[PDB]
Design an enzyme around this catalytic site. Structure first.
Site, short mmCIF file in Angstrom:
data_model
loop_
_atom_site.label_atom_id
_atom_site.label_comp_id
_atom_site.label_asym_id
_atom_site.label_seq_id
_atom_site.Cartn_x
_atom_site.Cartn_y
_atom_site.Cartn_z
N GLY A 1 0.99 -1.40 0.23
CA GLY A 1 0.01 0.41 -0.14
C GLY A 1 0.90 1.08 -0.01
O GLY A 1 2.38 1.44 -0.47
N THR A 2 -0.11 2.27 -0.56
CA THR A 2 0.79 3.68 -0.06
C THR A 2 1.21 4.11 1.53
O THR A 2 0.63 3.22 2.44
CB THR A 2 -0.37 4.89 -0.09
OG1 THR A 2 -1.15 5.62 0.53
CG2 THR A 2 -1.43 4.04 -0.96
N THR A 3 2.20 4.48 1.81
CA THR A 3 2.89 5.16 2.45
C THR A 3 2.11 6.31 3.17
O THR A 3 1.48 6.45 3.01
CB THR A 3 4.45 6.33 2.43
OG1 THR A 3 4.83 5.67 1.63
CG2 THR A 3 5.56 5.95 3.97
#
Lengths: 244, 231, 195, 250, 240, 241, 111, 235, 243
Positions: free
Chosen positions: I29-31
């Site tokens: 996933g994104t940070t």
């Protein structure tokens, strides 16, 4: 989820048999042989114990023969623990019938309900069937003396003489050979022991490897008595028919 | 592969295959496009027939007077989800006397879909939805996918070859976004966008479905003779 | 409902039941048969609360008919009577109890005896030579205590019954529009058509 | 969530064996030896307290448990399965007997209840069988003294004397030589102590052996006086000291 | 409760558990029903690996559902008891609410429905049983014969047979039964029924059962003697 | 071998999931040790804070279950906290139902029975933890009772748990062989904590700063855990010896 | 003892012409001898050219009207925007009311 | 094995797809919609000459204005018919009107996907639901076990269907009279039927606004079969 | 083997492979990050701009629980929402019974125990998210990170998702170069930098920054989003630091 571990106890084979029922019967076939014989004047139940150790308490024991009510008894072949579950059900079911109608339960009706319980475990609920076969010996004032067997399939049939457990093929042949309709109870007793004596996988039949019961009219006029033979009484009946 | 038997299983790379296969029924679905200005929002959907003797499967469902959606994938799953939405818009009115914000409609759909992606014996929804509405903060377009992911967009498209319409809108952005106070121009730009997704077939009169909602227009559906105007 | 009697003589059981059905100040019907055949040699009369009576009698009849088919056999009157008592004994502690009193007259074929069972709505069972429910008993029990004999013929039973019905027509406040009489013996159940 | 395992985990194989009962018996085989001997005026049950670490306090681990004031149990197999069975066994003596008849159940019947519990774990949904075999010793007024073995299948049998677990085949043989129907209780204790030394490797003393009797009623162990007909428990656990006393004379 | 979908589709669109239930029926003893002009007869093979039977008390193969309708079957016996019980309860329930006994079509439709329900409910297997259901609608003399099977399909038959070697006896019935001319009497019909069973049976000893149903609850079993007569009469005529 | 995935018996009468749950016990690579004084019971456990980004105060495997009972867990923290919360609930309900403080050994038995169930019922997995319960019981005095995934439990003179547990165990057995008694014959809990740390040092062959340890002490009527500063005080006292 | 009903007064009146119909009601709402409001309308347009009033206990009246309006909404949703005829509305309203036969809406209703 | 509610990697429900196979094995059913009525026709397909073919009930009344023909596992349809009838009669009770054909069909199709681990498997039968209502006139719907239903001017289901559907594609026009349509159904049935079409192994029905849903007697169909041969012989 | 096909089954190592597979979905996933500061906490997350068509500012990902708790997560977004919905019920119930708003450690265990519960049966799937969350209570500021296994601890700073290691490195610098504390306004800037720095590991697509905070002094202990002048000011501060 959990489907991975489900044996599916209640399905058909491609040949249309119930695996678990077949396998239960296979289990039962290694159990001590039990025999019922019906006379005109009574019924005999005889059953052989799973190879006794000398240190077993023989007299305060009940492995094969159970009393359902005053007029009905069963001989067991299979898992004892499974059989006691079904026996208490039967015992209760007889008592509800008495309570409802004020008459002792007709033998067939009790046999049908037990057989119906067994059937259920083969069609729904996904549980293993009961690993038990019964010989029912009882009396009622419609049909008189009756013998029935039921097995894990929930099928039941009636008999003049029949056996369950080990070596029933052998035993059925011998019963078929020497049984006759007019036969009395004491002839039946003799037949039952002589049959077990020939089919036993043991060296020779002793009292300590046997359970024995009769249902006669043998008390006081038109009334029925159940006798579960004590060890000493078996030992005597074993002498009186010269098996020992 | 060994990890696609049910939704309750993760693959070794952290994927949910039953969800991805559910996404796959959307891709097989007939194309539908949504887009909006600041005053209206429009749905266009290409309907599909079984053969020449059959009706063209409805792709647009009205949810309230100020909300509705278009579908691509399993139709009954859209019926279940659109029904759920009708109830939520309804609950909002009867209890709070409040029109359901399109944003909250999104969150409610997301959470409904998600329950089916974490428990045994259920299955993910097999349908994608484009939700339009006009609420207390203007025109909205939403994109629902059965993973649970919901996204607010100026415009978009889903279904077979949606990629053409999706790039067209991506080019047309600054144009259509400002088609304010003009219903028929926004529709035309909708119809044009869906055309970039056609093959071996163009828009007929019983093939095309448009829906519009906005400032002083209740969510209404046009099929049949009242779309001819736009081919 | 109101009047139901039964007499058990030598070889049969006789049930007499009033024909009137009354609601308010209207006799709605004067030819009501307050009885159900439970099995070919068992008959049940009933009186009590409107609706409950027929609903109960038919429910019992259905169960006994089911038993007969299942076992291809007819329950004894004693057995049917015990089944019925238990149902009433359950009912009295239900949310809404059946308010029905019954008489069960049967011929037991195994025993070749007629039997008469009186059971009230509480599930109070007694076997009797003669029985009644409701106010009827206040006249008929003492009358029968006097005129009844254990060894009477079916004809003598019917006359004994005429005596009862005569007294009830003379002294009871209400017009119960006569009775329907039914005999239960070794040959089953039949209805006398002139009383 | 919840139990989606509503099907049997023990089923018949094509030969007719019930695998999980068989395998549970195998677990009992591995288990530490225990035994019971029936005398004319009492019963003895005994086992080894094979401690996991010497830092453990093995008196805090009771392998021999009172079930009723006249019934005791011991086991071979999996300890924790035994613990919960004892819990369930004590409770069922009350709920389905004492709370009904105002007296404790007779031995065969309490045994029968335990067996029922164990049979159900052999057939119910979502469970394995119990991995133990029990020896239950007890007294009741109309049956006298008795001794029962209960297996994972739920089968039970009465015994004059027997042993279960690790060194049971040898122990059963030892007990056949020594058992007679005239044994007084002290004789059976002494025989139990002999039989058990066979199957014990390490230290053999009052702290490593657990041994209880069903014998005479113990007024001193009742807790109160004044009801002549209440005479006290017949179950008594022998003390470390009492065992060592009998080992000198071994 | 136990939930598992046991009756499910396979890639060729077959429901294997229903099909395997049919196998269990094929293994069952043979049953046949033939309808006369004014009657219906039900005949049943009794497998003859069994002597020392007590026939006074062994469950007969033809069951009365109500006093005017009978049901026989091939397949698992224990399964059949469940259908018969339910059918009997419904028979009485129909009288209690409709104040009329069941039509044969109705009773059949009920039993068929029970069978179908067990082919799409969680946790249960289908009934390893097919049935012949025969009798007369009340105040009607036109005879009825129906057949049900584990799938739940049911239909009416001029005559029909189920169970082991039923294909042999269906073959027989197809060349020996004139639709145009049904067995005009009881005598005639019982004979055609015995003949068809004799193609498949063995000796017609205690190996055949026959039950006759006439209108208005006129149902009787035949005894060894009377069947034996039919056996002996057909074999003698056969020597040609 | 699906007999290796759920808690049913293997052909040699074994429960592989229970065995594998024991292996999860050491997943954290912490050792723990507990001893009894005359008046007290002391539990120590290594505290390892790898990541610099962690708030070290929130990193703990010791739990205050009741006012009188402390519990140290060897195993993954999720399962540890699951056991801790349950034990807190069970200890509180016991007080409410029966009107006295739940004894250490009874709580141990109760958690042991709960673990036993997961070994028998298929839908529940065992917890990958070992629970050491400590208190000064009002009837039994200083107490250590320990629970494992098999549902086994017993009381201890002293005990240790973790990867290097056997070293610590034999170290302790050797002490009691020499001492000839059941406990640390020391007056203050401070000196029992010193004993505990000292013998962990010899057996592990490592030295500790104040942030390498975690200490819980049970006295009559309270169980409490020491701050870094209380431990430092304790470390200092050992060094000057 | 808590009494779940009240009487909010008012009166309503409907007449039918050949090609029109009227439904009138006063706008006064009362409890006991007090006026709650001189203008609280109790005759409503319910869509599909049906007007409705539920006079008596206002809480029950507002609950009923709210429910019927909702019924009209779902009739459209479930039957492809079909117009709800007056005879069908009448029947629908019967079921609305009779569904509370044992705890009634205390209103006299006219459409 | 694998769950009953499993998606294939192509995004289809295995169990629904497999039920579609079972339906292809079923006997033929055909419906045609005209401005004068809708005709429904079926192949009875007696499995043996001994079975009484009038007891084969594959066309069925739902309400006076709605009929239904089936193909596939026809026992699976009893409860769908039961649901339909109840839904229709119930709707009339609540609304004092006739229930729309589309609404009825939608009601039946709601049943379809209520299966899983609710019933245990999809239905193995397709339905042709035909009727009349005031708002939309004569209508024909094909209801599948996928819960999807499609409206059709004409449709064929069962074994002869891809053949018959291509036939209907050519022959259907928006001006068919009822008689023209009855003939057409008979024609196409005789083409795709194994055995030779007659009044005992095929059955016709129509639903008109005036007389509602009527199943034709065998005498009436016979004359239409005779009439069909005469029209074919004569070109 | 096959130990990894069913949740809650222990491997012979002692591991629950299904939980570990859920971690792969998180790492995918994104940070997102959280930075604990003097009297508060800051949350930020990278939002990939899949398309021109995503309405900027209008797909909000950081969520509030009660009035004092912020939550942000990386992984399967719907799973994170499910978790916050539960967190909301848990905080509602706590406040209902005890009056006071839920303390942060108390709230952390509520999520922990619920997440851990989804590793106990094979009839559920573990959560496909690591969740960073925190706020201010009567005992000061608290920052927490919670993983699919149900493991959580308190953090000085914390990161998760694709840019997790880059952000960790950056966070370690901060903790080292400010041992006496970081202010709330400072931490908002740092947050923006670190998200921009961690966007290196995800840079096909460009992104939208989103920040939020709770500070006893700057927001009155309430959770607010960073918007307008303050957001832009922090975007700017980050733009500087990458060139």
């Amino acid at each position: 989820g959990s489907r991975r571990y489900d044996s599916r106890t209640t399905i058909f084979s491609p040949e249309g048999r119930l695996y678990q029922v077949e396998y239960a019967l296979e289990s039962i076939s290694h159990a001590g042989t039990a025999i019922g014989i019906m006379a005109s004047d009574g019924i005999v139940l005889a059953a052989e114990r799973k190879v006794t150790s000398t240190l077993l308490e023989q007299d305060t024991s009940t492995e094969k023969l159970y009393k359902l009510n005053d007029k009905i008894a069963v001989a067991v072949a299979g898992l004892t623990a499974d059989a006691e579950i079904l026996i208490n059900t039967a015992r209760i079911h007889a008592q509800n019938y008495l309570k409802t109608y004020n008459e002792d339960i007709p033998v067939e009706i009790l046999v049908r309900r037990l057989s119906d319980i067994k059937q259920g475990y083969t069609q729904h609920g996904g549980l293993r069937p009961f690993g038990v076969s019964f010989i029912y010996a009882g009396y009622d004032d419609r049909y008189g003396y009756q013998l029935y067997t039921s097995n894990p399939s929930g099928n039941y049939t009636g008999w003049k003489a029949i056996s369950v457990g080990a070596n029933t093929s052998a035993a059925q042949t011998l019963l078929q050979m020497d049984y006759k309709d007019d036969m009395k109870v004491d002839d039946a007793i003799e037949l039952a022991l002589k049959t077990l004596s020939k089919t036993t996988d043991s060296s020779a039949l002793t009292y300590d490897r046997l359970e024995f019961a009769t249902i006669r009219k043998g008390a006081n006029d038109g009334e029925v008595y159940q006798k579960i033979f004590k060890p000493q009484e078996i030992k005597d009946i074993l002498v009186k028919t010269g098996i020992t | 592969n060994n990890y696609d038997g049910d939704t309750v299983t993760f693959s070794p790379t952290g994927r949910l295959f039953q969800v991805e296969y559910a996404l796959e029924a959307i891709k097989q679905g007939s194309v539908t496009v949504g887009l909006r200005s600041n005053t209206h929002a429009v749905l266009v959907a290409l309907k599909r027939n079984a053969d020449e003797l059959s009706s063209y499967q409805k792709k647009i469902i009205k949810c309230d007077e100020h909300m509705g959606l278009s579908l691509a994938g399993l139709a009954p799953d859209a019926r279940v989800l659109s029904n759920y939405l009708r109830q939520q818009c309804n609950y909002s009115s009867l209890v709070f006397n409040r029109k359901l914000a399109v944003e909250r409609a999104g969150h409610l759909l997301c959470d409904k879909a998600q329950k089916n992606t974490q428990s045994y014996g259920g299955r993910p929804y097999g349908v994608g939805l484009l939700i339009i509405g006009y609420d207390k903060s203007g025109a909205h377009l939403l994109e629902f996918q059965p993973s649970g992911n919901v996204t607010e967009l100026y415009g978009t498209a889903i279904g077979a070859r949606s990629q053409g319409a999706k790039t067209y809108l991506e080019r047309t952005l600054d144009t259509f976004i400002k088609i304010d106070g003009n219903p028929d121009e926004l529709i035309k730009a909708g119809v044009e966008a869906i055309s970039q997704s056609l093959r071996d077939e163009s828009l007929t009169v019983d093939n095309l479905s448009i829906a519009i909602v906005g400032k002083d227009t209740p969510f209404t559906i046009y099929d049949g003779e009242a779309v001819a105007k736009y081919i | 409902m109101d009047i139901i009697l039964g007499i058990r003589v030598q070889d049969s059981v006789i049930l007499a039941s009033s024909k009137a059905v009354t609601r308010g100040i209207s006799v709605l019907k004067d030819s009501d048969d307050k009885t159900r055949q439970l099995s070919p040699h068992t008959l049940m009369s009933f009186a009590g609360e409107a609706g409950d009576t027929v609903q109960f009698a038919e429910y019992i009849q259905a169960n006994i008919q089911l038993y007969s088919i299942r076992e291809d056999y007819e329950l004894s009157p004693q057995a049917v009577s015990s089944f019925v008592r238990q149902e009433l004994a359950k009912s009295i502690r239900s949310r809404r109890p059946y308010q029905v009193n019954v008489l069960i007259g049967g011929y037991d074929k195994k025993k070749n005896k007629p039997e008469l069972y009186q059971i009230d709505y509480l599930g109070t069972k007694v076997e009797l030579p003669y029985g009644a429910h409701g106010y009827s008993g206040f006249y008929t029990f003492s009358l029968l205590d006097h005129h009844y004999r254990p060894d009477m013929t079916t004809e003598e039973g019917l006359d004994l019954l005429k005596l009862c019905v005569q007294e009830l027509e003379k002294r009871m406040p209400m017009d119960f529009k006569g009775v329907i009489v039914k005999i239960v013996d070794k040959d089953g159940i039949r209805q006398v058509d002139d009383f | 969530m919840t139990d989606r395992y509503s099907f049997s985990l023990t089923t018949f194989s094509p030969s007719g064996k019930l695998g999980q009962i068989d395998y549970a018996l195998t677990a009992v085989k591995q288990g530490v030896t225990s035994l019971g001997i029936k005398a004319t005026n009492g019963v003895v049950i005994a086992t080894e307290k094979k401690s996991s670490s010497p830092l453990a306090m093995s008196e805090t681990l009771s392998k021999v448990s009172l079930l009723t004031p006249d019934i005791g149990a011991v086991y071979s197999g999996m300890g924790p399965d035994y613990r919960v069975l004892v819990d369930k066994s004590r409770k069922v003596a009350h709920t389905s007997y004492k709370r009904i008849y105002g007296e404790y159940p007779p031995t065969k019947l309490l045994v029968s209840e335990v067996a029922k519990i164990m049979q159900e774990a052999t057939q119910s949904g979502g469970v394995r069988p119990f991995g133990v075999s029990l020896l239950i010793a007890g007294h009741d007024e109309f049956n006298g003294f008795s001794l029962y073995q209960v297996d994972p299948s739920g089968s039970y049998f009465p015994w004059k004397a027997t042993a279960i677990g690790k060194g049971s085949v040898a122990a059963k043989t030892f007990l056949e030589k020594r058992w007679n129907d005239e044994l007084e209780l002290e004789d059976a204790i002494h025989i139990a102590l002999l039989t058990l030394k066979e199957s014990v490797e390490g230290e053999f003393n009052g702290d490593t052996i657990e041994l209880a009797i069903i014998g005479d009623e113990n007024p001193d162990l009742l807790g109160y006086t004044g009801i002549p007909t209440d005479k006290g428990p017949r179950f008594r656990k022998l003390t470390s000291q009492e065992i060592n006393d009998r080992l000198e004379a071994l | 409760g136990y939930d598992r979908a046991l009756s499910i589709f396979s890639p060729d669109g077959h429901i294997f558990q229903v099909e395997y239930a049919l196998e269990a029926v094929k293994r069952g003893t043979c049953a046949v029903g033939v309808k006369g002009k004014n009657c219906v007869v039900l005949g049943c093979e009794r497998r003859s690996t069994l002597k020392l039977q007590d026939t006074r008390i062994t469950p007969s193969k033809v069951s009365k559902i109500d006093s005017h309708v009978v049901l026989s079957f091939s397949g698992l016996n224990a399964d059949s008891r469940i259908l018969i019980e339910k059918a009997r309860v419904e028979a009485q329930s129909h009288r209690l609410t409709l104040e009329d006994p069941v039509t044969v079509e109705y009773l059949t439709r009920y039993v068929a429905g029970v069978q179908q329900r067990y082919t799409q409910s969680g946790g249960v297997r289908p009934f390893g049983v097919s049935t012949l259901i025969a009798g007369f609608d009340p105040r009607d003399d036109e005879p009825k014969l129906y057949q049900t099977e584990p799938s739940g399909i049911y239909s009416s038959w001029s005559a029909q047979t189920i169970g082991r070697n039923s294909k042999t006896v269906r073959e027989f019935l197809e060349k020996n039964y004139d639709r145009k001319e049904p067995p005009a009497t009881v005598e005639e019909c019982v004979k055609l029924t015995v003949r068809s069973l004799l193609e498949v049976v063995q000796t017609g000893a205690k190996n055949i059962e026959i039950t006759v149903v006439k209108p208005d609850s006129d149902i009787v079993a035949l005894s060894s003697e009377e069947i034996n007569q039919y056996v002996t009469q057909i074999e003698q005529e056969k020597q040609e | 071998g699906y007999d290796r995935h759920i808690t049913i018996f293997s052909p040699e009468g074994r429960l592989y999931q229970v065995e594998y749950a024991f292996k999860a016990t050491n997943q954290t690579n912490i050792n723990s040790l507990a001893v009894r004084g005359k008046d007290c019971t002391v539990v120590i456990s290594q505290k390892k804070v790898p990541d610099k980004l962690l708030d070290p105060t929130t990193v703990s495997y010791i739990f205050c279950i009741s006012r009188t009972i402390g519990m140290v867990v060897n195993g993954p923290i999720p399962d540890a906290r699951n056991a801790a919360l349950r034990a807190k609930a069970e200890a509180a309900e016991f007080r409410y139902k029966y009107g006295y403080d739940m004894p250490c050994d009874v709580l141990a038995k109760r958690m042991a029975n709960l673990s036993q169930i997961y070994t028998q019922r298929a839908y529940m997995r065992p917890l990958g933890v070992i629970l050491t319960f400590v208190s000064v019981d009002e009837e039994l005095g200083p107490s250590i009772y320990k629970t494992d995934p098999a549902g086994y439990y017993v009381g201890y003179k002293a005990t240790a748990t973790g990867p290097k547990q056997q070293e610590i165990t034999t170290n302790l057995e050797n002490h009691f062989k020499k001492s000839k008694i059941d406990h640390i014959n020391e007056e203050s809990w401070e000196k029992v904590v010193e004993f505990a740390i000292t013998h962990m040092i010899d057996a592990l062959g490592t030295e500790f700063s104040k942030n390498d340890l975690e200490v819980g002490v049970a006295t009559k009527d309270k169980f409490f855990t020491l701050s870094a500063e209380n431990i430092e005080e304790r470390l200092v006292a050992i060094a000057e010896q | 003892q808590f009494n779940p009903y009240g009487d909010n007064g008012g009166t309503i009146l409907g007449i039918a012409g050949e090609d029109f119909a009227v439904l009138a009601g006063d706008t006064r709402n009362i409890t006991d001898y007090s006026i709650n409001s001189r203008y609280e309308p109790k005759v409503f347009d319910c869509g599909d050219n049906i007007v409705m009033s539920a006079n008596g206990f206002a809480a029950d009246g507002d609950a009923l009207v709210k429910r019927f309006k909702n019924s009209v909404k779902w009739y459209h949703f479930d039957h492809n925007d079909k117009k709800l005829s007056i005879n069908s509305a009448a029947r629908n309203i019967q079921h609305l009311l009779y569904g509370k036969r044992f705890f009634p809406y205390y209103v006299h209703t006219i459409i | 094995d694998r769950g009953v509610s499993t998606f294939s990697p192509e995004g289809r429900l295995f169990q629904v797809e497999y039920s579609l196979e079972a339906i292809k094995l079923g006997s033929t059913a055909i419906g045609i919609a005209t401005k004068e009525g809708v005709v429904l026709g079926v192949e009875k397909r007696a499995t043996s000459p001994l079975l009484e073919s009038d007891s084969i009930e594959k066309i069925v009344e739902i309400d006076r204005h709605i009929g239904c023909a089936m193909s596939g596992l026809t026992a699976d349809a009893r409860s769908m018919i039961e649901h339909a009838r109840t839904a229709a009669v119930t709707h009339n009770l609540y609304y004092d009107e006739d229930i729309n054909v589309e609404s009825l069909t939608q009601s039946v199709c709601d049943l379809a996907l209520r299966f899983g681990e609710l019933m245990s498997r999809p239905f193995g039968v397709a339905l042709l639901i035909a009727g009349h209502d005031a708002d939309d006139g004569y209508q024909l719907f094909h209801a599948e076990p996928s819960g999807t239903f499609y409206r059709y001017n004409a449709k064929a289901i069962g074994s002869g269907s891809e053949g018959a559907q291509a036939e209907l594609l050519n022959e259907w026009h928006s001006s068919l009279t009822l008689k023209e349509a009855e003939l057409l159904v008979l024609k196409i049935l005789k083409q795709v039927m194994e055995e030779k079409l007659d009044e005992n192994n095929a059955q016709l029905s129509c639903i008109t606004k005036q007389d509602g849903f009527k199943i034709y007697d065998n005498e009436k169909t016979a004359e239409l079969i005779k009439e069909l041969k005469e029209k074919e012989a004569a070109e | 083997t096959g130990y990894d096909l069913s949740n809650s089954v222990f491997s012979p190592d002692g591991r629950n492979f299904q939980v570990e597979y859920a971690v792969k979905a998180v790492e995918n996933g994104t940070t997102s990050i959280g930075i604990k500061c003097n009297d508060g906490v800051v949350f930020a997350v990278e939002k990939l701009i899949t398309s021109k068509l995503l309405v900027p500012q209008k797909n909000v990902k950081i969520q509030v629980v009660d009035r004092h708790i912020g939550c942000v997560y990386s992984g399967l977004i719907p799973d994170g929402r499910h978790l916050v919905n539960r967190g909301r019920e848990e905080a509602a119930s706590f406040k209902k019974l005890y009056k006071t708003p839920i303390p942060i450690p108390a709230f952390a265990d509520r999520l922990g125990q619920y997440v851990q519960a989804h590793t106990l049966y094979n009839s559920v799937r573990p959560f496909g998210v690591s969740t960073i969350f925190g706020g201010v209570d009567k005992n000061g500021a608290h920052l927490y990170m919670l993983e699919p296994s149900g493991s959580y601890w308190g953090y000085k700073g914390a990161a998760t998702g694709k840019g997790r290691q880059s952000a960790k490195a950056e966070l370690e610098k901060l903790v080292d170069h400010h041992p006496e504390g970081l202010s709330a306004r400072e931490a908002v800037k740092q947050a923006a930098k670190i998200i921009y720095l961690a966007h290196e590991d995800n840079k096909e697509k460009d992104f939208e920054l989103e920040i939020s905070w709770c500070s006893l002094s700057e927001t009155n202990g309430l959770h607010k989003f960073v918007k307008g002048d303050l957001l832009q000011e922090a975007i700017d501060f980050a733009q500087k630091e990458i060139n």
